[PDB]
Amino acid sequence: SPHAKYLRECLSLAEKSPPRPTNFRVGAILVSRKEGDYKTEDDRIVSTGYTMELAGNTHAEQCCLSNYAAVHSVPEDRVWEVLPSEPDRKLVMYVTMEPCGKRLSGNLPCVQRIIRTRQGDRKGIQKIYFGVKEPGTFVGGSEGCQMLTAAGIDWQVVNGLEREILEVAVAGHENREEEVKAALDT
Ligand SMILES: [Zn+2]
């Protein structure tokens, strides 16, 4: 029931991203939630991020994790060491678009950044909610979801915001409206 509201908040974050011809403007919010029959009032925000918030070609989930790493004085690849890990609460990430499993640049894709939060005695991110089953990349597809499943990370599509998520995501693109159609038809 709170998922649509979190995704709208993710979309507001995405709107902070600079429109560019080749980026996908996405927002992400990391939440600590009680396991079981939880109450939304007990959710705690752990971090937020959006595309290109941090210098260079950075994705929303990447920035969300890197923001937390910076606040906790660790390199971003070591954010797993500092993310919350309490057995009765789980970490859930909301993100407007499906986390990428492949990138055009040489940068590590977002699903791999998510999977590596589960190391040692740290539970890591247990579930991803997103609003469109397309990644924030030109590659498209579902490879991110396949890798999450293979790694034991739950995911769930939250319907009802697809057009707005795509319109924001591709705002900087030359033929954005035609591209939004192609995605909505897919
Ligand atoms: Zn990504």
Side-chain angles (χ1 to χ4, degrees), residues 59-61 98-101 103 108-111 136-137:
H59 285 193
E61 307 93 295
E98 175 190 0
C100 63
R103 289 184 60 169
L108 188 66
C110 281
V111 167
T137 64

mmCIF file with all atom_site columns, all heavy atoms in Angstrom, residues 59-61 98-101 103 108-111 136-137, ligand 1:
data_model
loop_
_atom_site.group_PDB
_atom_site.id
_atom_site.type_symbol
_atom_site.label_atom_id
_atom_site.label_alt_id
_atom_site.label_comp_id
_atom_site.label_asym_id
_atom_site.label_entity_id
_atom_site.label_seq_id
_atom_site.pdbx_PDB_ins_code
_atom_site.Cartn_x
_atom_site.Cartn_y
_atom_site.Cartn_z
_atom_site.occupancy
_atom_site.B_iso_or_equiv
_atom_site.pdbx_formal_charge
_atom_site.auth_seq_id
_atom_site.auth_comp_id
_atom_site.auth_asym_id
_atom_site.auth_atom_id
_atom_site.pdbx_PDB_model_num
ATOM   1   N  N   . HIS A 1 59  ? 24.375 6.245  -11.686 1.00 0.00 ? 59  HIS A N   1
ATOM   2   C  CA  . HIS A 1 59  ? 22.971 5.865  -11.638 1.00 0.00 ? 59  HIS A CA  1
ATOM   3   C  C   . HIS A 1 59  ? 22.370 6.173  -10.268 1.00 0.00 ? 59  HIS A C   1
ATOM   4   O  O   . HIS A 1 59  ? 23.074 6.448  -9.298  1.00 0.00 ? 59  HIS A O   1
ATOM   5   C  CB  . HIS A 1 59  ? 22.824 4.382  -11.957 1.00 0.00 ? 59  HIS A CB  1
ATOM   6   C  CG  . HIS A 1 59  ? 22.992 4.063  -13.408 1.00 0.00 ? 59  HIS A CG  1
ATOM   7   N  ND1 . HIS A 1 59  ? 22.638 2.845  -13.945 1.00 0.00 ? 59  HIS A ND1 1
ATOM   8   C  CD2 . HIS A 1 59  ? 23.499 4.794  -14.431 1.00 0.00 ? 59  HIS A CD2 1
ATOM   9   C  CE1 . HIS A 1 59  ? 22.895 2.846  -15.241 1.00 0.00 ? 59  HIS A CE1 1
ATOM   10  N  NE2 . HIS A 1 59  ? 23.428 4.014  -15.560 1.00 0.00 ? 59  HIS A NE2 1
ATOM   11  N  N   . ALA A 1 60  ? 21.037 6.107  -10.186 1.00 0.00 ? 60  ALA A N   1
ATOM   12  C  CA  . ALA A 1 60  ? 20.349 6.470  -8.945  1.00 0.00 ? 60  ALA A CA  1
ATOM   13  C  C   . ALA A 1 60  ? 20.717 5.535  -7.799  1.00 0.00 ? 60  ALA A C   1
ATOM   14  O  O   . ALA A 1 60  ? 20.994 5.990  -6.676  1.00 0.00 ? 60  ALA A O   1
ATOM   15  C  CB  . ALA A 1 60  ? 18.841 6.433  -9.164  1.00 0.00 ? 60  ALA A CB  1
ATOM   16  N  N   . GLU A 1 61  ? 20.668 4.218  -8.046  1.00 0.00 ? 61  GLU A N   1
ATOM   17  C  CA  . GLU A 1 61  ? 20.960 3.265  -6.977  1.00 0.00 ? 61  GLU A CA  1
ATOM   18  C  C   . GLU A 1 61  ? 22.409 3.380  -6.551  1.00 0.00 ? 61  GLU A C   1
ATOM   19  O  O   . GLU A 1 61  ? 22.731 3.257  -5.359  1.00 0.00 ? 61  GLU A O   1
ATOM   20  C  CB  . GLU A 1 61  ? 20.671 1.838  -7.461  1.00 0.00 ? 61  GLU A CB  1
ATOM   21  C  CG  . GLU A 1 61  ? 19.270 1.629  -8.048  1.00 0.00 ? 61  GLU A CG  1
ATOM   22  C  CD  . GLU A 1 61  ? 19.216 1.798  -9.567  1.00 0.00 ? 61  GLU A CD  1
ATOM   23  O  OE1 . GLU A 1 61  ? 19.444 2.905  -10.082 1.00 0.00 ? 61  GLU A OE1 1
ATOM   24  O  OE2 . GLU A 1 61  ? 18.934 0.810  -10.261 1.00 0.00 ? 61  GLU A OE2 1
ATOM   25  N  N   . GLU A 1 98  ? 13.676 -0.454 -13.314 1.00 0.00 ? 98  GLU A N   1
ATOM   26  C  CA  . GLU A 1 98  ? 14.333 -1.706 -12.962 1.00 0.00 ? 98  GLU A CA  1
ATOM   27  C  C   . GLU A 1 98  ? 15.844 -1.489 -12.846 1.00 0.00 ? 98  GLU A C   1
ATOM   28  O  O   . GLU A 1 98  ? 16.438 -0.861 -13.727 1.00 0.00 ? 98  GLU A O   1
ATOM   29  C  CB  . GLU A 1 98  ? 14.065 -2.724 -14.076 1.00 0.00 ? 98  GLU A CB  1
ATOM   30  C  CG  . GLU A 1 98  ? 14.793 -4.044 -13.920 1.00 0.00 ? 98  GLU A CG  1
ATOM   31  C  CD  . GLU A 1 98  ? 14.688 -4.903 -15.165 1.00 0.00 ? 98  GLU A CD  1
ATOM   32  O  OE1 . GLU A 1 98  ? 14.052 -4.458 -16.140 1.00 0.00 ? 98  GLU A OE1 1
ATOM   33  O  OE2 . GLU A 1 98  ? 15.250 -6.016 -15.180 1.00 0.00 ? 98  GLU A OE2 1
ATOM   34  N  N   . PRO A 1 99  ? 16.489 -1.982 -11.787 1.00 0.00 ? 99  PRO A N   1
ATOM   35  C  CA  . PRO A 1 99  ? 17.953 -1.845 -11.701 1.00 0.00 ? 99  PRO A CA  1
ATOM   36  C  C   . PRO A 1 99  ? 18.662 -2.546 -12.851 1.00 0.00 ? 99  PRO A C   1
ATOM   37  O  O   . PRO A 1 99  ? 18.310 -3.663 -13.239 1.00 0.00 ? 99  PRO A O   1
ATOM   38  C  CB  . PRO A 1 99  ? 18.298 -2.498 -10.354 1.00 0.00 ? 99  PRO A CB  1
ATOM   39  C  CG  . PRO A 1 99  ? 17.070 -3.256 -9.947  1.00 0.00 ? 99  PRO A CG  1
ATOM   40  C  CD  . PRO A 1 99  ? 15.906 -2.566 -10.569 1.00 0.00 ? 99  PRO A CD  1
ATOM   41  N  N   . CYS A 1 100 ? 19.678 -1.883 -13.388 1.00 0.00 ? 100 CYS A N   1
ATOM   42  C  CA  . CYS A 1 100 ? 20.356 -2.409 -14.561 1.00 0.00 ? 100 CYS A CA  1
ATOM   43  C  C   . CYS A 1 100 ? 21.258 -3.587 -14.209 1.00 0.00 ? 100 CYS A C   1
ATOM   44  O  O   . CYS A 1 100 ? 21.846 -3.662 -13.120 1.00 0.00 ? 100 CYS A O   1
ATOM   45  C  CB  . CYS A 1 100 ? 21.161 -1.320 -15.277 1.00 0.00 ? 100 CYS A CB  1
ATOM   46  S  SG  . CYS A 1 100 ? 22.548 -0.570 -14.328 1.00 0.00 ? 100 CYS A SG  1
ATOM   47  N  N   . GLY A 1 101 ? 21.360 -4.513 -15.156 1.00 0.00 ? 101 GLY A N   1
ATOM   48  C  CA  . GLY A 1 101 ? 22.264 -5.637 -15.014 1.00 0.00 ? 101 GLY A CA  1
ATOM   49  C  C   . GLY A 1 101 ? 23.410 -5.583 -15.999 1.00 0.00 ? 101 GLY A C   1
ATOM   50  O  O   . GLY A 1 101 ? 24.313 -6.426 -15.970 1.00 0.00 ? 101 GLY A O   1
ATOM   51  N  N   . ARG A 1 103 ? 25.583 -2.297 -18.396 1.00 0.00 ? 103 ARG A N   1
ATOM   52  C  CA  . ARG A 1 103 ? 25.722 -0.878 -18.690 1.00 0.00 ? 103 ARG A CA  1
ATOM   53  C  C   . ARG A 1 103 ? 26.556 -0.695 -19.947 1.00 0.00 ? 103 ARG A C   1
ATOM   54  O  O   . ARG A 1 103 ? 27.414 -1.521 -20.262 1.00 0.00 ? 103 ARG A O   1
ATOM   55  C  CB  . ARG A 1 103 ? 26.352 -0.112 -17.512 1.00 0.00 ? 103 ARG A CB  1
ATOM   56  C  CG  . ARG A 1 103 ? 25.417 0.018  -16.329 1.00 0.00 ? 103 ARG A CG  1
ATOM   57  C  CD  . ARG A 1 103 ? 26.006 0.869  -15.204 1.00 0.00 ? 103 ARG A CD  1
ATOM   58  N  NE  . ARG A 1 103 ? 26.295 2.227  -15.652 1.00 0.00 ? 103 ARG A NE  1
ATOM   59  C  CZ  . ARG A 1 103 ? 26.616 3.232  -14.844 1.00 0.00 ? 103 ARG A CZ  1
ATOM   60  N  NH1 . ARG A 1 103 ? 26.691 3.042  -13.532 1.00 0.00 ? 103 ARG A NH1 1
ATOM   61  N  NH2 . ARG A 1 103 ? 26.869 4.431  -15.359 1.00 0.00 ? 103 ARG A NH2 1
ATOM   62  N  N   . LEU A 1 108 ? 30.217 -0.769 -13.069 1.00 0.00 ? 108 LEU A N   1
ATOM   63  C  CA  . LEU A 1 108 ? 29.520 -1.926 -12.525 1.00 0.00 ? 108 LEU A CA  1
ATOM   64  C  C   . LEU A 1 108 ? 28.018 -1.661 -12.541 1.00 0.00 ? 108 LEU A C   1
ATOM   65  O  O   . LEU A 1 108 ? 27.582 -0.587 -12.102 1.00 0.00 ? 108 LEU A O   1
ATOM   66  C  CB  . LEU A 1 108 ? 29.968 -2.166 -11.087 1.00 0.00 ? 108 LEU A CB  1
ATOM   67  C  CG  . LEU A 1 108 ? 29.442 -3.462 -10.465 1.00 0.00 ? 108 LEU A CG  1
ATOM   68  C  CD1 . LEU A 1 108 ? 30.029 -4.677 -11.177 1.00 0.00 ? 108 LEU A CD1 1
ATOM   69  C  CD2 . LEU A 1 108 ? 29.742 -3.518 -8.972  1.00 0.00 ? 108 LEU A CD2 1
ATOM   70  N  N   . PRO A 1 109 ? 27.202 -2.583 -13.046 1.00 0.00 ? 109 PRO A N   1
ATOM   71  C  CA  . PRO A 1 109 ? 25.758 -2.334 -13.075 1.00 0.00 ? 109 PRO A CA  1
ATOM   72  C  C   . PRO A 1 109 ? 25.157 -2.318 -11.673 1.00 0.00 ? 109 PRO A C   1
ATOM   73  O  O   . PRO A 1 109 ? 25.758 -2.734 -10.681 1.00 0.00 ? 109 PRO A O   1
ATOM   74  C  CB  . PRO A 1 109 ? 25.201 -3.472 -13.931 1.00 0.00 ? 109 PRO A CB  1
ATOM   75  C  CG  . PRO A 1 109 ? 26.378 -3.928 -14.752 1.00 0.00 ? 109 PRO A CG  1
ATOM   76  C  CD  . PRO A 1 109 ? 27.559 -3.778 -13.830 1.00 0.00 ? 109 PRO A CD  1
ATOM   77  N  N   . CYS A 1 110 ? 23.924 -1.829 -11.608 1.00 0.00 ? 110 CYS A N   1
ATOM   78  C  CA  . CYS A 1 110 ? 23.321 -1.524 -10.318 1.00 0.00 ? 110 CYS A CA  1
ATOM   79  C  C   . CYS A 1 110 ? 22.931 -2.797 -9.577  1.00 0.00 ? 110 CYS A C   1
ATOM   80  O  O   . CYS A 1 110 ? 23.032 -2.858 -8.350  1.00 0.00 ? 110 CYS A O   1
ATOM   81  C  CB  . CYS A 1 110 ? 22.092 -0.654 -10.563 1.00 0.00 ? 110 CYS A CB  1
ATOM   82  S  SG  . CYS A 1 110 ? 22.526 1.066  -10.879 1.00 0.00 ? 110 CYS A SG  1
ATOM   83  N  N   . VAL A 1 111 ? 22.496 -3.832 -10.303 1.00 0.00 ? 111 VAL A N   1
ATOM   84  C  CA  . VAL A 1 111 ? 22.130 -5.081 -9.640  1.00 0.00 ? 111 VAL A CA  1
ATOM   85  C  C   . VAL A 1 111 ? 23.328 -5.670 -8.909  1.00 0.00 ? 111 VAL A C   1
ATOM   86  O  O   . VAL A 1 111 ? 23.202 -6.190 -7.792  1.00 0.00 ? 111 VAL A O   1
ATOM   87  C  CB  . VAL A 1 111 ? 21.499 -6.071 -10.639 1.00 0.00 ? 111 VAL A CB  1
ATOM   88  C  CG1 . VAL A 1 111 ? 21.425 -7.467 -10.039 1.00 0.00 ? 111 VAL A CG1 1
ATOM   89  C  CG2 . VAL A 1 111 ? 20.114 -5.603 -11.033 1.00 0.00 ? 111 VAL A CG2 1
ATOM   90  N  N   . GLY A 1 136 ? 17.285 1.662  -16.525 1.00 0.00 ? 136 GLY A N   1
ATOM   91  C  CA  . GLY A 1 136 ? 17.676 3.018  -16.852 1.00 0.00 ? 136 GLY A CA  1
ATOM   92  C  C   . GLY A 1 136 ? 18.905 3.058  -17.728 1.00 0.00 ? 136 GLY A C   1
ATOM   93  O  O   . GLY A 1 136 ? 19.903 3.699  -17.390 1.00 0.00 ? 136 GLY A O   1
ATOM   94  N  N   . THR A 1 137 ? 18.842 2.348  -18.858 1.00 0.00 ? 137 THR A N   1
ATOM   95  C  CA  . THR A 1 137 ? 19.917 2.264  -19.835 1.00 0.00 ? 137 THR A CA  1
ATOM   96  C  C   . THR A 1 137 ? 19.276 2.048  -21.192 1.00 0.00 ? 137 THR A C   1
ATOM   97  O  O   . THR A 1 137 ? 18.105 1.676  -21.291 1.00 0.00 ? 137 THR A O   1
ATOM   98  C  CB  . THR A 1 137 ? 20.817 1.044  -19.610 1.00 0.00 ? 137 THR A CB  1
ATOM   99  O  OG1 . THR A 1 137 ? 20.047 -0.150 -19.804 1.00 0.00 ? 137 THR A OG1 1
ATOM   100 C  CG2 . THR A 1 137 ? 21.458 1.043  -18.234 1.00 0.00 ? 137 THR A CG2 1
HETATM 101 ZN ZN  . ZN  B 2 .   ? 21.875 1.148  -13.096 1.00 0.00 ? 1   ZN  B ZN  1
#
